[PDB]
Amino acid sequence: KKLRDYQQTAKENALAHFKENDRGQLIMAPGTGKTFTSLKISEALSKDKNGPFKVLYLVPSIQLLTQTLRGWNNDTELTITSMAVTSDRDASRGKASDIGYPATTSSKKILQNWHDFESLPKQTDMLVVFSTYQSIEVIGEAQKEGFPEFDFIISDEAHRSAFSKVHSNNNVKGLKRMYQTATPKIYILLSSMDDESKYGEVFFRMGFGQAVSRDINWSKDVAKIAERQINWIKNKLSKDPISLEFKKFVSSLQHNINDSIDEKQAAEMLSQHLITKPIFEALFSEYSFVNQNPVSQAMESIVSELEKAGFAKEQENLEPLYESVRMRAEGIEDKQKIIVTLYDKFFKTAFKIVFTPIEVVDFIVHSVDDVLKKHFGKSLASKDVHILDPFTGTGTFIVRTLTYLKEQMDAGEISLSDITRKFMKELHANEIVLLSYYIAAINIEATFDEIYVPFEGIVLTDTFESTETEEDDYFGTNDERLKRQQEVPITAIIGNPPYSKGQSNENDNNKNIEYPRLFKSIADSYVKNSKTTSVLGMYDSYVLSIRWASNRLNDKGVIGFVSNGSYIDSQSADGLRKSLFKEFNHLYIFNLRGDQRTQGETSRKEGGKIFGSGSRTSIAISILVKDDSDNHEVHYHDIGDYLTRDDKLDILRDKESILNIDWENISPDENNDWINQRDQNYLNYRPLADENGSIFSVKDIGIVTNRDAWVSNFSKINVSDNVQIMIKNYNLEVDRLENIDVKLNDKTVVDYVTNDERKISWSRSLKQRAARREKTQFSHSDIMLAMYRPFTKKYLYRNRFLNENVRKTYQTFPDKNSKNLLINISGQGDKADFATLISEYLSDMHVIGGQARNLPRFTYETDGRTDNIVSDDEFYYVYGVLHSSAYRKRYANDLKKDLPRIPLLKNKDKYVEIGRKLSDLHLNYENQPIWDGIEVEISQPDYRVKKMKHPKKGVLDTIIYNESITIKNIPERAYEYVVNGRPAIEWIIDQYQVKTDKKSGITDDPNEFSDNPKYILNLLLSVITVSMRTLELIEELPEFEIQE
DNA sequence: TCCTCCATCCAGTCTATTAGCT
DNA sequence: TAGCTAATAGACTGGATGGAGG
């Protein structure tokens, strides 16, 4: 016979596979006949070997053994000598009789039989021993007795205790092992052929669905095929005009989105297209989504010139996935149901976006619609109203918009003729991601079929880069949809703009793209109106989105967004609030809270996260109304404390629009603050620093090393060691840069350096010194003590090099033997309540909250002790006042939003007294007489800590120091003393705990700090009484009154 | 130009508890 | 079973980085 075409393929793949490997599987439907193909494969290896070629064909049943023995000799092109092993003599027959050496179970007979075969005057081409799995051991009994190895071994019906003996050479000596079945999966799941280091990879596969089509969530292979695609390009790139055309394809892509894209990124984008194209075709069934779409066509075009060049789609391995889709999408909102799944099953896993809650999306649509109605008199469906969704994602903000229209049409207020034009001409949206674009298109196209029409209004772009520059084409039809869009007077901008303020440093791949023309817009508006000088947040993507939309909007229109709600009350957003109040007439701000970068009570008050695990930021819905008017007013509502994620959504389903919300009329103040407005009388109080007649001449803010795991630690020795590793690692990168002379820069250097966070913790400044050739010495003298957290003092390598921000610490603590007092305070915009803690040592920025200011008692000079304040009495007076409950409560807003101001109080000398005591207590926090009721049970003297805990949640009576020591009868009120938002006692639990740095793998063990095994236990106990004592003292200081 | 240094807000990820599994 | 793994609920960090002023 002549081997069928796909059999040739299998033969080819087999040979190619066994060229490097020694194990392979062969999957075919029962119909084709793998038995014949196996012979033809065996022949090819026989051709190559140039000697007697030995094959072992293992088989379960007796019927198969005879069907293969006979059927092979008939189909054999070669000279074949056959061997049967079995307890049935008749099993080696065909009519015919004794076909090959007779069947036998006698190993000595099987061994001597091969001696015969060798004794022949002439040996045939290949020797095929057909055997049962049951008696396979006789082969082992033969190969031991003097039988040769097997050049090839074949297991048929491979889904199968001697059945498992084959895999190891120890049982049967053989060079290569092929596995053939039609069903590696046994029907739960009992048996599956997944190598197990035995079955091996598969070089060929045939689906039953294929053959019928051929006329006869586990996907890691997408990597394999893509790696083949991506690599073959870069190779062929190398002056092959394809490179000239593909380098033209990237430039076209670069045009439509970013210079960010290049050979790698662009090639990756086409990979994803090749994979999903058949899925989209399969989904469509009758009418091709691919042929219609511009990007598809643009992608389905560029493939051609490469397809011409001896490059195919390597997705033959992916065909069973395609078949499942073809089955799943045959015939058939039941189609949208598939779109839900395929996304979650395939796409989520395959290549690895934020899913916007429907209750949110619907809310602004109604809100935008009712706004268009009440104000302009117009509506959502008018001819001269255009709607843009600049960050479509999956087109959720369109899908739910046309659904609103559908509800309107059923109510009869709308004509489908009024809908159709919107879908066609008046609805626009765009995405920056390939897969998000496709899915977004379909989902609108499909949800429009409710009443086949492609969506004409979708682009694939970076809306920010759109208005940047105005200057050969691929995708030329794509931007045409956008070019024609750009003349539209867009009356409404809608959606969920991106949130991004930056990164953590060594994720260099991530850094907010520079949009120079938009930054300048931000710079002249939001940044200009600010009083801050630190405006990082104003270049956050969501603030860019408001800017870009504010520009792209027309004088008569509206915006509706779900965004980061930080700008509502934020230090660096005072300018943005000044702008929005001028640039807009009516602004409804719906604060959804849900900020979980807080902690403690604040965290509980914030509550549910609107995007769940999607975002940790404060969320708020903003609808900005723009008309011609002399009227300017803010409308604000706090959704309320403590609400769950779905409690908040229950309100969004309940209230579909901003018409039904009880708004608060807000008149912004001098500081452009909408909420938590300050007291203008508070300004009469004596300034603390930076003004005339201020109490302190100089204030500092806590240190920020930017690499705590390396530079700070409980063990002084560990700091010395760890710092030296990094300094060595850093000076090596420099030595590398030394002998590769270029014009290096503070950012370009990234490509020539390590990026491994187990080696170096890069920061901006450190990169700058690597752009130059700068080395360092390790100065052991620079290792000193510092307050890292309240009542937690670690060792710190304070070094201008390797510390991103050393602040004024060299003025307040010139060396590790210096003597100074500083009053740490919560700084400028903490959400937690205001607190203060005095320190005898250098203080981190996070001693209190996220940004901590400190007020030194002394400043030093190297040319020099200098009084930074008049007297000790004045110093401790300040410390006394900052503890006043009335003071803290009366001006919570001024304490949050700016540096404190101290008034002159009626019983001042009393404030000094308690000021001193409080200081005396908080400095000696680590050794204090234990409180009365407390008891300490110690089984054995194990004073080492792993992690302190309460036996159950919120039992404040007890703390398990470890599995030996426990502390009981702790007064529950001691937890009322709070620094930041956390009790002092809980800081010890939190801080004095064994943990490792996930990034660097640097361990930090608090037991290595103190030399005294009872330090932490002593510290804990003391802090409890410090807590109790502090509260007593806070209750002693006088009634809050003015004017001494 | 580029460096020094003030200033401020961050589109989840880890651990702990409870319920299952052979 | 003893003591794991899986499902579910709870808790909440260190640092990047624009721009004034050299």
Numbering used by the authors: 176 to 269, 277 to 342, 354 to 380, 393 to 421, 718 to 739, 742 to 835, 839 to 858, 866 to 964, ...
Passage from the reporting paper:
RM enzymes prevent the integration, replication and expression of foreign DNA in the host bacterium by introducing double-strand (ds) DNA breaks into the invading genomes. In case of Type ISP enzymes, the entire gamut of tasks is carried out by the coordinated action of target recognition, methyltransferase (MTase), helicase-like ATPase and nuclease domains that constitute the single polypeptide chain. LlaGI recognizes 5′-CTnGAyG-3′, while LlaBIII recognizes 5′-TnAGCC-3′. Like LlaBIII, LlaGI contained six structural domains: the N-terminal Mrr-family nuclease, followed by the N-core and C-core RecA folds of the SF2 helicase-like ATPase domain, connected to the γ-class of N6-adenine MTase domain and the C-terminal TRD by an all α-helical coupler domain.
In continuation of our study of the mechanism of action Type ISP enzymes, we report here the co-crystal structures of a nuclease mutant of LlaGI and a nuclease-deleted mutant LlaGIΔN, bound to DNA substrate mimics. We chose to delete the residues 2–165, producing the recombinant protein LlaGIΔN. The translocation-active nuclease deletion mutant of LlaGI reported here highlights the modular nature of these enzymes. The structures of LlaGIΔN bound to a 22-bp DNA and full-length LlaGI bound to a 28-bp DNA were determined to a resolution of 2.84 and 7.4 Å, respectively. In the LlaGIΔN-DNA crystals there were two molecules in the asymmetric unit, while in LlaGI-DNA there were four. Like in the case of the LlaBIII-DNA complex, in both LlaGI-DNA and LlaGIΔN-DNA structures, the MTase domain and TRD held the target in a vice-like grip. In LlaGIΔN-DNA, the upstream end of the oligonucleotide was not long enough to interact with the ATPase domain. Instead, this end interacted with the ATPase domain of the neighbouring molecule of the asymmetric unit. In the LlaGIΔN structure, only a part of the C-core of chain B could be built with confidence, while the C-core of chain A could not be built due to poor electron density. In the LlaGIΔN and LlaBIII structures, specificity of the T:A base pair is ensured by the interactions made by the flipped adenine with the active site residues of the MTase domain located primarily on Loop I, which catalyse the transfer of methyl group.
